[PDB]
From Swiss-Prot, chain A:
Keyword Oxidoreductase among UniProt keywords: no
Protein family (similarity comment): Belongs to the ABC-4 integral membrane protein family. LolC/E subfamily.
Keyword rRNA-binding in annotation: no
Any one GO biological process: protein localization to outer membrane
Organism of provenance: Escherichia coli (strain K12)
Keyword field: Cell inner membrane, Cell membrane, Membrane, Transmembrane, Transmembrane helix, Transport
Protein name per its UniProtKB record: Lipoprotein-releasing system transmembrane protein LolC
Residue range from the parent sequence: 48 to 266 of 399
Membrane topology per record: Multi-pass membrane protein
Encoding gene per record: lolC
Coiled-coil stretches noted in the UniProt entry, renumbered to this chain: none
Function: Part of an ATP-dependent transport system LolCDE responsible for the release of lipoproteins targeted to the outer membrane from the inner membrane. Such a release is dependent of the sorting-signal (absence of an Asp at position 2 of the mature lipoprotein) and of LolA.
Any single Gene Ontology cellular-component annotation: outer membrane-bounded periplasmic space
Swiss-Prot record, chain B:
Protein name: Outer-membrane lipoprotein carrier protein
Main localization of the protein described in the UniProt heading: periplasm
Complex formation: Monomer.
Family recorded in the similarity comment: Belongs to the LolA family.
Provenance organism: Escherichia coli (strain K12)
Amino acid sequence: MNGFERELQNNILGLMPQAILSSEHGSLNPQQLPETAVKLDGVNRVAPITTGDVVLQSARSVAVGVMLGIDPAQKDPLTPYLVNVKQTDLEPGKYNVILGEQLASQLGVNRGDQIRVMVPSASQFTPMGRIPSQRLFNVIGTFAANSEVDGYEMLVNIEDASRLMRYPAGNITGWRLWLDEPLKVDSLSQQKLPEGSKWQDWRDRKGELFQAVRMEKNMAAALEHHHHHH
Amino acid sequence: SHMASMDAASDLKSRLDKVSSFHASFTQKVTDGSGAAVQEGQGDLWVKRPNLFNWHMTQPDESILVSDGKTLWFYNPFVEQATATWLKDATGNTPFMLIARNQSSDWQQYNIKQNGDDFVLTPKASNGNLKQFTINVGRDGTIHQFSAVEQDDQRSSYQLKSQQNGAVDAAKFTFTPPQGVTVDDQRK
């Protein structure tokens, strides 16, 4: 594992959803596919997530982000990096948000401000037009992990997130996976899945980075092979 | 012929002119280009021309769009929030807004054919993403149905029933959020 792979794994993949077991269609019902039914190879930990790409608007600016809707009672990899805010303040029905600190400074907000969160992928058809799902959230603080995720990730309560995603009540996006080897999602995606479930992973966010690490790795083995024959 | 569309626009307007406010129940059916249902619902509709309305969807999920003539309120009980925007910044060229406003200058923007009580409207030019819409309007000016085909071939129809023409209380066109509901006032 070279420095490039190490950087990706320790400072990016360690702070975002490495993979998610979701429904084949729409959201996931945790009664139909509970956490116990998620036994998969290369996975050391499973947790519920609701996530989506969002547009954020404050009184000053606009930004783009990734909403991580989490069960606040469990530890997230971001949890240690919260700055003077408790994760358990992300109570369901309060529409609180903890922003990455660079995302917060891009929007010009801190604890006590509001931001408008919109989900372009989730809409209501009405006789006045298509209305994207949106809501004000209360910024209760920030996290600072010293990573690029500080510029785009945010934590909210999973249930708030699910309502924003317009999921059926009690559904979630799916089961977040932590992998022993997050760099081998290529192989790990091929395994046998529960039925009408599907595998998504970090390549959806960072398909230009998984291809650059793969190119480099094969250039390295090809030349080491050439060196070793001749 | 142009003379058939002028005739039809004039008859559409004279019919809609007979009803200055109404209440009705509605059913809504929306489908993508594939003919697969992407949203369905029902509820109540109050209109007072030209721009007061209350669309209250009650099933399967509740939502409310209320216009006081200047403010448009969109209440989404699922997130316990109502947003306030200006009516003038909404999509002014939906079929619904045309039917509410009943303005001759609006109807002159469409080629109109009348087949019975069905009026079929096609934009005289489009960069607004409606290809076609239909309004069924009785001789008494009651609206029975309207439906629209968007540019992406998304289709929506509304069927109206139990129409009662005549005076609606002003309260129908004001919004008051329930207890615990927050307001996002977007009005600049």
